[PDB]
Amino acid sequence: VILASAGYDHTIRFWEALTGVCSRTIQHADSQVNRLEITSDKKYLAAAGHLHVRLYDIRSNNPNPVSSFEGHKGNVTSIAFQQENRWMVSSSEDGTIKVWDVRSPSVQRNYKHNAPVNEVAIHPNQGELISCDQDGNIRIWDLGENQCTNQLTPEDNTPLQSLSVASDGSMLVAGNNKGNCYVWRMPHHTDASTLEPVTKFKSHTKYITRVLLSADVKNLATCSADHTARVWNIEDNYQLETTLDGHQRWVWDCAFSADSAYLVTACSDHYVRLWDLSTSEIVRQYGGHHKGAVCVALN
Amino acid sequence: CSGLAGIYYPLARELFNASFAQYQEDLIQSLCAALSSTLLNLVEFMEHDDKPLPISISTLGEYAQRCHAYAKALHYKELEFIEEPSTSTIESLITINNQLHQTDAAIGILKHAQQHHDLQLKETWYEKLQRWDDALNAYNKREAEVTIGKMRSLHALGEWDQLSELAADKWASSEVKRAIAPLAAGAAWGLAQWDRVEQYIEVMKPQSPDKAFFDAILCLHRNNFEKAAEHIFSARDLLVTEMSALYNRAYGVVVRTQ
Amino acid sequence: MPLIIDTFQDQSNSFKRGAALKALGQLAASSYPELLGVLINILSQNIRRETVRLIGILGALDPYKHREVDVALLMQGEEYYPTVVIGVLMKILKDSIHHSTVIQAIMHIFQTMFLKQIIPGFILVMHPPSLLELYFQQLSVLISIVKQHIRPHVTEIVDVISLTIISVIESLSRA
Amino acid sequence: MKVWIKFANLCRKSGRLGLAQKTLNTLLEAPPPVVYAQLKYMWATGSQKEALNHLISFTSRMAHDLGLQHHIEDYTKLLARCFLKQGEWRVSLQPNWRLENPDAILGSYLLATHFDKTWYKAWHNWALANFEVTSSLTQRIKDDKVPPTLNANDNFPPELVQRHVVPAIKGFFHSIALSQSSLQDTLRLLTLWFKFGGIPEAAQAMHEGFGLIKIDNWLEVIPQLISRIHQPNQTVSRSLLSLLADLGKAHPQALVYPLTVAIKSDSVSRQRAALSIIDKMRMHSPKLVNQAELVSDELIRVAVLWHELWYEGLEDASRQFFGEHNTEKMFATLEPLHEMLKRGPETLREISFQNSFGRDLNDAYEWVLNYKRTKDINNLNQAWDIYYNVFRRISRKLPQLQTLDLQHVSPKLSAAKDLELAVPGTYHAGKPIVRITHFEPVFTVISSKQRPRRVIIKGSDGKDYQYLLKSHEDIRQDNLVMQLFGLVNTLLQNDPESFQRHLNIQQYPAIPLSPKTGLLGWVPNSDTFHVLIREHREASKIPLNIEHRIMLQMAPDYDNLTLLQKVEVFTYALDNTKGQDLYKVLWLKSRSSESWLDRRTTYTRSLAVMSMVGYILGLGDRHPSNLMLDRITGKVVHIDFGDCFEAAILREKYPEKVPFRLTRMLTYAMEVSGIEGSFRITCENVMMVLRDNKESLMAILEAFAYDPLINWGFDLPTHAVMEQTGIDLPLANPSELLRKGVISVEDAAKMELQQKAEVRNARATLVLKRIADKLTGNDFPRCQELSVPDQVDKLIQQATSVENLCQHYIGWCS
C-alpha cells in the first residue's frame, strides 16, 4: 500500500502507509507528472509532464531510471498498464493514442482521435478497450490488434476529459468539461458493450475532473478544480454521498485504494487532505509538492 | 493679482498636493468646501486632483456629482457603479445614461443586469420597453400605471383599438389627467374620431404642447383658423424655448417640432 | 418669411445648412418671438454630419486643445509638474500687462536658477523702453545657460534696435 | 400613394408591427407598386409560389397592358416588372440555381435585364446576376474541369458558349461600372475576364467595353492588376497589358508605384514585361518617371544597413552550416554575401566605412573561399573563425548602429532635396499631389529583429509623412489589406444608421518596396497596446508582468501545463489580477472627461470593426504588440496582418483561435458590461456585412485573396509552405513517380509549383468555404445561418472561452 502524489512542484515523494509522510526521491522535475501510475507488481512507475513518459521504479527506492518511454507528443493524459503489465496502454495529448507497452518498455499502438487522447482504457477483457478523447465519441481499441472503434458519444460538444472504465463488465462512466458526468450501462461483453446511458450527473457542476467508481463501485467520486467535490453512492442511482472537503485545489486524483473508508485526495493547496471515505476526516493531510498538486498512486 | 482663475485652480492643485505632501485640517476644510454649494469650477478642480491621485470622499464625490447635474458626472457615478453591484445605483446609472442619451449601450448593460445580477422590476420594464423589448412582457406583467406604460407601448405599437381599451381605462380612471392626455392623444391619432379627441383635449392640460397641436388640430378638424393660429404661435413659442435650451440629441426632436 | 415663400418654391439644404446652423445658433442667440417665428418657419443625420464638416472648417485645433489644456501638461505629465507649472505661467504670460510678464520672467529664471526657456526666448522676442531694460536684465539672467538656438534670435532682437549697449555687451560676455 | 407607398417600403425596412400594419392599411388604401408591396409583405410571409404566382400574374398583366401618364406609369411599372422577375428569381434561387434551373433563372434575369433601361444598377447586380451565371457556368466549367477525367477548358466553355453567355454579362459588367458592385464587382468581373480567356468574342467585346468605360475605374485594383504579371497567353492579354500601360499612362504618376515595385522585384519574363511598361513610363512624361525611378531606387538604397544585413544574415548562414552541416548550401548564401561583398564599399561611409572590416573579412572570406573550395577543412575553419570575430565586431557596431543618418551612410538619399511627385503614398486620385521637402538625413532606426528604421519625410505640403523600413514583408498583402478595409469602409459609407453610428477603419498607407521589403509609416499619434500598457502599468509602479509573475508563482511552467493545470492557473492568476488599469488609461486619456465617454464609444466601435474584420479575415495577431490604439481621442490600431488563415491552423506554437482578442477586464471595463451592446452593435454591423456584399463583394475580396505569386505568396506563408511541408507524400504517383521514370522531371520540371499552387487554390477554396460558413453563415457543430443573434453569440462565446483561447502562448498576453 505504497502511497505518493505528484505536484507542479515537479518533485514527488512516497507517503508512508498511515503516516502520509512523504519520503522518496521522485522528480517530475524538468516537468510535472500528468497521471500517476505504478506497475502491476509495482515495479516501475511512469508519468509525463511534457512530451515524454518517464518511469522511476516503484519497486526500487527512488530509482531515477526505471524506464523512459517516448510517445505521441504531449503530456500523456492517461495510460493503462495491463494485468500482463507487458502490453500496456497509453494515451497522449498528441491527438492520437499511442500506447507504450511495457514490452521492452516497447511501444506500438495507433489510435487516432479528433483531439488529444484523453485516457488509455481497458474493457471487462483487459485485452479489450475503447478510446474517448477530449473531442468526442469513444473509440473501441483491442490489444495490439483488431483496434478501430465503436463510437460512443455522451455529448456532441463537451470535451471528454478521459475514457473511464473500471472493472464491472457492465458499466460506463466518465468525467469532462461538463461537470455533470455522463455515465451509461454497458452490456456483458469482452468488449461489445452497447451502452445504456445512466445520466449526466453534476456533483460539482463546474469542470468535474477526476471520475472514479468505488472499489466495489457501490460508490462513486467526482473531483473538480473548482475546489468542489461530492461523492455519490453508485450503488443506488449514483445517489450523491460525500462532499469532499478541500481547499482551493485541483484534484485530478480522487480515490480510496485499500480503504473505501478513508478518502485520499488531491490538493493544489500543496497539502493534500485525505478524508474518510466512510464519512470524512483529515487523514495525514499534507503534500510533497511545495506548490501544490493533482495526482496520487497506490502500491 | 492679474487674477487668473485657471491659473489658480491648477496651482491650487499643486498646493493641494503640498498639503497632500495631517491635513486633517485640509481634510475637513475641503470637505465642507465641497459642502458649500463657481460650484462646478472647484468641482472640476477636485476632479483634476482625483485624476492626479485620489482625494477620496468617494460617494461624497458621487453625491456632489449628482448635485452638479451636468451629466459629465455620469462618468464619476460610472466609476461608482463600477465599484460595486448596486442594482439601485445600477438603475441610477441607467437613467443617468438615459440623460446622457448614450443609453443604447447602457440598455445593453441593463439587459445584462437582468441577465447578470438578479433583475429589477420597474425601471427594468420601463427601459426594456425603451428597448424594443418588454412589450408583450409589460402586457402580461400588467395583465399579471405600468399598464399606462404598456399603453404607451401600444401607442408605440399599432392597434388604436387597443388604445380604445386604454381609453376605456381612461373613462374608468380620469395623473389621471396626464395619463389620459398622452393616451387619448395616441387614440385620436389612431382613431380619426373627432369626438373622443374632443374628450381627450378637453381632459388634457393648461400647458399642453401636444394638445395645443390637438387644439389647432380640432380647429382645423372643422373650420377655425383663429384658435388654431393661437395654438400655432403659442406652442411655437413653447418649443422655441425648448430648443432654446439646446444634433446630437434634439435634431430629430426639434425636427419634429418644425 | 422670404425663405418661407422660397420654400414654397423649393427645398434648401446646400450651403444654407451651415448657415441655418449658424442661424439656428443665431436663433438661439438672438432669441421677441422674432427668432421664434423664424425657426418656426425654418421648415437630419446626413445634413448634421455635413454641417459638422463645414463647422470643422469654421473652427478647429487650438480651442479644442485649449479645452484640452497645462491640465494638458499634467495629462502628458514632481520636477516635471513644477516645470509644467512654469510653462503654464509662461503660457498665460505670452498670452496684456507687460511688466507682469517682466517680473514673471525675472523670478522665472531666478527659480530656474530649459526648453520652456527656449520657448520663452521667442516670448521675450515678442517684446516702451522699460521693456528693453527689463528684457536686457532678463538676457543677463539668460547668461546662466548656453545657447545653442537662442543665439540667432538673440542677434535678431539685438538688431532692433541697436543704452542696451551694456546689455548686448553682456550678451557677448555670455557668449 | 407612392408617398404612402414609400411609407410602406419604410414599414418593410421597419420592424414587423408597423410593417404588416401599414401593409394592410395601404393595401386597403395601377397599384403595381402596391402589388410589389403586398408582394414584399408576402416575402415577409415567405410563401414561395404565392409570390411566384402573383409575380407572374402581374407580369402577364403588364404584358397584356403594354403588349410586346399611364404610359410612363407603365415605364416605371416595367422597371418594377423586370425587378420583380429578378426578385422572385433570387427568392427561388435560394432553393436553387445550382446548375439546372439557374439557366432559365438567368434567362429571366437577362429577360428582366433585356427589359430594363433601368434601376439596372440594380440589374447591374443582375448583370452581375448574369455574370454569376457566367460564374456558376464557370463553376460548371469548374465542375467540368474538376471532373475532366488552356485550350481544353477553352473549348469546353466554348461551343455554346458559356463564354458567349459570359461576354454579354461582361459588357453589361462594364455597363455596371457605368451604373455605380462598384469597384468590387468591377475588379471581380475584370479578373474574371482576364482569366476567362483572350478569345475572339472576348477579345473584341472586352476591347470595346474596357475601351468604352473609364480609366480611374481601372485605377483601383492596380495592385491586383500587377497581380497579373506574366500572361501565359500573351494573346489579347498581351494587348490587355497594353491596355494596362495605357490606362497607366493616364495619371501614371498619380500612382506609378506598382510600376516601380514590379520593376524592383524580379518577375523575369514578367519583369521584362515590367521593363516594357517601364518604357511606357519612360515614355509618357518620362521625366517624372526618371525622378521617381531615382526615388524608389534610393529607397531600396537605404534598405538595410548593408554590411550589417550581410553580417546577421551570414550569422544565420553559419548557423545553418554548423548546424546539420549545411555548409556549401549555406555557403551558397555566403556566396551571395560574397556577391554583397562583390558590390564593394559602395555607399558613403557605410559600405565605405565597412570596407576595412569587410575588406579583412573579405580576405578571410577569400581565404574561406579558397580552401573550402579546395575540399573542406582549412577554410572551413577560417570561415567560421573570421565570421565569429566579424560577428563580434559587427555585434558591437550593431549596438552602435542604433543611430541612423543618410549622409554618413548613403548620402545619395540626402542628395535629393526635392522631387516633383512625392505624395508618399498619399495617392489621392484627385489631389494636390505633394512634392517633398524630404527630411533630415538622420533617421530613426527601429529596434527589432528587423530593426525597421523609420523617418517622417517633410513634403511640399509641409506634412512629414512617416515612412518605415520593412524587412521581408508584403505591403502588397497589406495593400490588399487596406484595400479590403476600403471595401469595408465602403460598406460603412454604404451603411444604415450604423453609418450614423459610423466608425470606419483608418487605413495606414504603406508602400511596398522590394520583392521582400516595404515602406511603412508611423501612424497618427498612437499607443501600441503592449507598449502603452507596459508603460502605464509600470508607471503604475508595479511589475510589468504580473502575468509571468503570477504564472511562475503558480507553478514552474505553462509549457507543460495541461488543460486543467493551465485552466486553474489562469483562473487563479486572473483572480489575483484585473484589467482596470486599462480603463484607468482611458481615465488617463479621459481629459475633459467627455473624452472618457466618447473615446469609450470610440474604442468600443474600434473593437467592433476589428472583430468583424478578423473574424472575416482571420489574421488575429494576438500580440498586444500587434495590438495598438491611438494617442489621439483614439481608435484601435490592428496592424501588420500576417494572413487570412488561422494562426492556430498555422501553429505550430499554441492553439489560438478566437474571432476577436480581448484583454478581459480591459474590454469589459472599457464600457459597462463588456461589449454587451458594443459587441451587439458589432453584431449589427457584422450582420450588415453578413448580408450586404456578403455574397458579391465578400466573394470578390475573397478572389482578391485568391490568385497568384505575390498573393499566392501571402497565402503560401499563410500555410506556410513550411507547414505545407512533407507528407507521404505523393498525391498518388509523385513519390514513385520521382523514380527512374525521371530524369524527365529535370527535363520537364514546371510543376512542381502548379501542384503547390493547386494546393493554394485548395486552401483558398477552403478559405472561402470558411467565409460562407463565416458569412451568413455557419460554424460549429450546428449551423443554420445562425444569423445575427447566434453567429454573434457563438462569436461572443469564442471570445469568452477559453483558457483554450488563453492557451495562446506568450502572444495572448493575458
Author numbering:
A (entry chain D): 3 to 301
B (entry chain A): 1245 to 1265, 1274 to 1289, 1299 to 1405, 1412 to 1441, 1444 to 1515, 1520 to 1531
C (entry chain A): 785 to 815, 825 to 836, 841 to 866, 884 to 891, 897 to 914, 918 to 935, 942 to 955, 958 to 992, ...
D (entry chain A): 1590 to 1618, 1631 to 1669, 1687 to 1767, 1783 to 1813, 1815 to 2448
Copied sentences from the primary study:
Focusing on the heterodimer that forms the core of both TORC1 and TORC2, we have determined a 6 Å resolution structure of the full-length Tor–Lst8 complex from the thermotolerant yeast Kluyveromyces marxianus (KmTor). Our structure shows that KmTor–Lst8 forms a dimer of heterodimers, in which the two KmTor subunits embrace each other with their helical solenoids. The Fourier shell correlation plot suggests that the overall resolution of the structure is ∼6 Å, with the highest local resolution (5 Å) corresponding to the FATKIN and the N- and C-terminal regions of the α-solenoid that contact the FATKIN. The structure of each monomer shows an extensive N-terminal helical solenoid with a complex topology that precedes the FATKIN. The N-terminus of KmTor forms a highly curved spiral consisting of about 800 residues arranged into 36 helices (residues 64–837). The spiral is followed by a linker (residues 838–894) that runs along the surface of the FATKIN to connect the spiral to a region that we will refer to as the 'bridge' (residues 895–1169). The bridge is followed by a 32-residue linker that we refer to as the ‘railing' (residues 1170–1201) that folds back and runs over the entire length of the bridge, ending in several helices (Nα52–Nα56) that form a 'cap' (residues 1202–1292), which packs between the N-terminal end of the bridge and the TRD1 of the FATKIN. The second, smaller interface consists of the HRD domain of one Tor interacting with the HRD of the other, via three helices (α24, α26 and α28) making intermolecular contacts at the center of the dimer. This dimeric arrangement of KmTor places the two active sites facing away from each other, with the two FATKINs resting on a cradle made up of two N-terminal helical solenoids.
The Ser/Thr protein kinase Tor is a hub for cellular homeostatic regulation. While some yeast species such as Saccharomyces cerevisiae have two genes that encode Tor1 and Tor2 proteins, mammalian cells have a single gene encoding mTOR910. Both Tor and mTOR occur in two complexes known as TORC1 and TORC2. Lst8 is a requisite component for both TORC1 and TORC2. PIKKs share a catalytic core consisting of a kinase domain flanked by a helical FAT domain (named after FKBP12 Rapamycin Associated Protein (FRAP)–ATM–TRRAP) at the N-terminus and a short FAT-C domain at its C-terminus.
